[PDB]
Amino acid sequence: TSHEAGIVCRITKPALLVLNHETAKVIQTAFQRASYPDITGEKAMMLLGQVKYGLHNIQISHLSIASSQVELVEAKSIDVSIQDVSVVFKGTLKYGYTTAWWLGIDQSIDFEIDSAIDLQINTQLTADSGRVRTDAPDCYLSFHKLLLHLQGEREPGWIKQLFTNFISFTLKLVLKGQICKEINVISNIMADFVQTRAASILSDGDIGVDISLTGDPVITASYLESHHKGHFIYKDVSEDLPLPTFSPTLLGDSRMLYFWFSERVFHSLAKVAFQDGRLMLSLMGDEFKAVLETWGFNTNQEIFQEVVGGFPSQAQVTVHCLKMPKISCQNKGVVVDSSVMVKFLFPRPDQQHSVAYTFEEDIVTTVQASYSKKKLFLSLLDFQITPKTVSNLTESSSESIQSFLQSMITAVGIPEVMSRLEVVFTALMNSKGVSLFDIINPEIITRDGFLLLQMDFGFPEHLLVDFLQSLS
Ligand SMILES: CCCCCCCC/C=C\CCCCCCCC(=O)OC[C@H](COP(=O)(O)OCC[N+](C)(C)C)OC(=O)CCCCCCC/C=C\CCCCCCCC
Ligand SMILES: CCCCCCCC/C=C\CCCCCCCC(=O)OC[C@H](COP(=O)(O)OCC[N+](C)(C)C)OC(=O)CCCCCCC/C=C\CCCCCCCC
Ligand SMILES: CCCCCCCC/C=C\CCCCCCCC(=O)O[C@H]1CC[C@@]2(C)C(=CC[C@H]3[C@@H]4CC[C@H]([C@H](C)CCCC(C)C)[C@@]4(C)CC[C@@H]32)C1
Ligand SMILES: CCCCCCCC/C=C\CCCCCCCC(=O)O[C@H]1CC[C@@]2(C)C(=CC[C@H]3[C@@H]4CC[C@H]([C@H](C)CCCC(C)C)[C@@]4(C)CC[C@@H]32)C1
Ligand SMILES: *[C@@H]1O[C@H](CO[C@@H]2O[C@@H](C)[C@@H](O)[C@@H](O)[C@@H]2O)[C@@H](O[C@H]2O[C@H](CO)[C@@H](O)[C@H](O)[C@H]2NC(C)=O)[C@H](O)[C@H]1NC(C)=O
Ligand SMILES: [Cl-]
């Protein structure tokens, strides 16, 4: 089929398989969070009269898991089978022979309950409140054993029989209610957390993002796919604009993670970014000098002397966008068409001899992108510069002074701004946790109308441990 979405996330079977390595940590958390209530009553026992009993303070004492498999069922669910969770519970048995007063005082015996269980959890994914919800109403438990063992192996005659006939089957059913219920809460905590962190990665100060879902997620034998709006929000105003169409066939399913972004999302980001007054740069005395030195030039050079010239520590250059930049994705790259104002001031003791220029121009850049060693790299495939109105502010002006400045915009300006841009977007990623992941051979691929992120990842097994630990 086809979906209306600004942003699409596709998590493939291979990704689930490396995620499955930590299924046991999740099941462990579920058992540790479950409540096991006191089992009490007072029953007539054979030859022994009314006996009042209670199993008390049931606590998990040991828990291990043998293995887990994961399978995607087309249009239905993510199905995880877990074999041989062995749980040892401990508790305290308290009873007294109520009617048989001649048999002596009430008793207290420590016990353990030993079980082995296979679980089958079939999780369905649905949209709720623009959020992906998880639901496993089909959560199967199969007990291999549930055996009571008293400390000291005491048997007056009524205990093993009572446990077997009145206690285990209703306990099994209580166990299932608690475990399955708690599998459901952890699953929804983990789903909601990812979504909130996704949104956080796309947010900054007064800039937020709406990644509300546009329909129920999709499951096939090969992947699962969520479709989001991707509208940027500025000071809590958003524009609920029509959604671009998305075609599932656009994506492969061999990498672990695919992210498809419409160019409409870039339009949205350029829009709020411009509104926030962010698309600007200022270089004063020694910052201007430092920028030239980065690109292999030097304010003390002969060729800079007529422009800068005597007081290079007092140079001033500003760039700012005049209107919102225009961003397109194309097969060749991402094209940003920017209308800028570049202002120069290289003062002299006499202000009449200060070189002072302003350049209104469109600069169009075709850019390709790389991710490597935890950094974003931006590449210039080509550029075009078309001035609209150049102004000199003093008499100190010449076709060759103007052409020096233009050449600086081109040779130093463009590559400097690109450098600053990649540094800024890399720091936005890092500060939101992206650095912590092992992103493996990611590809950034531009096409007509959309950008593609494809990658494998490594899951630092300690990150899930700490998150589950942080749940308390
Ligand atoms: C679409 C991207 C917009 C930028 C591309 C336009 C090309 C540039 C066009 C013209 C250049 C002229 C001006 C050059 C100066 C910019 C270069 C630079 O020097 O610096 C980049 C700055 C960051 O500088 P600054 O914030 O300190 O402001 C400084 C301003 N002053 C001090 C007043 C607060 O501007 C920014 O980066 C703006 C972006 C910040 C967005 C923050 C929200 C985080 C959201 C998402 C993260 C990534 C999205 C993931 C992919 C989804 C698809 C969209
Ligand atoms: C993480 C999901 C990866 C796989 C899904 C890929 C889809 C990606 C979609 C969108 C991108 C969103 C990014 C994913 C979220 C992690 C981002 C992250 O890098 O965040 C780091 C933090 C660590 O510190 P902090 O929480 O204090 O935040 C403060 C962070 N600072 C201090 C660095 C600023 O948090 C953490 O890493 C918490 C890590 C544990 C949370 C796992 C939640 C669900 C993941 C796996 C489920 C395992 C179940 C196995 C069953 C499989 C059966 C199929
Ligand atoms: C992994 C590398 C991350 C680094 C990526 C850096 C790229 C940054 C750039 C752009 C950010 C893109 C923003 C896009 C918006 C995405 C929206 C977005 O966040 O989509 C998320 C929606 C929910 C979910 C489908 C997901 C994640 C994992 C899923 C969960 C894993 C386990 C969960 C099971 C239910 C657990 C069952 C266990 C039990 C023992 C039976 C499961 C499947 C629930 C749903 C999530 C992606
Ligand atoms: C001495 C100096 C005097 C000169 C004065 C200066 C004068 C200069 C004047 C004007 C300069 C203007 C020209 C420069 C404009 C260049 C435009 C320019 O560089 O535009 C680029 C801006 C960043 C971006 C939007 C882009 C394309 C790629 C995008 C990236 C793709 C994925 C990236 C994700 C966030 C990361 C996911 C990776 C994951 C962690 C695995 C993403 C979306 C970041 C944003 C970029 C185009
Ligand atoms: C900006 O410099 C002007 C002199 O420069 C030339 O003309 C520019 C338009 C530009 O093409 C540049 O490359 C050329 O070198 C200057 O313009 C005029 O004014 C002065 C004094 O009134 C006059 O002597 C000069 O000959 C005039 N030139 C022309 C061709 O019009 C202008 O004064 C200056 N701007 C300001 C406000 O300082
Ligand atoms: Cl006894």
Side-chain angles (χ1 to χ4, degrees), residues 173-188:
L173 290 167
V174 161
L175 290 182
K176 187 229 167 209
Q178 289 287 318
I179 294 312
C180 289
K181 186 259 269 275
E182 219 60 34
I183 282 174
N184 273 278
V185 341
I186 188 57
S187 294
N188 281 104

Side-chain angles (χ1 to χ4, degrees), residues 421-449:
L421 244 13
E422 69 187 27
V423 158
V424 167
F425 281 93
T426 298
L428 284 170
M429 288 309 82
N430 284 348
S431 77
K432 255 67 185 271
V434 188
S435 49
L436 310 182
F437 276 76
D438 176 35
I439 291 161
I440 302 161
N441 179 32
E443 304 166 282
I444 307 180
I445 300 167
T446 47
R447 292 278 166 267
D448 181 15

Side-chain angles (χ1 to χ4, degrees), residues 334-345:
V334 167
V335 11
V336 183
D337 173 9
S338 315
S339 180
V340 301
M341 173 66 90
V342 191
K343 272 143 110 143
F344 286 103
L345 209 218

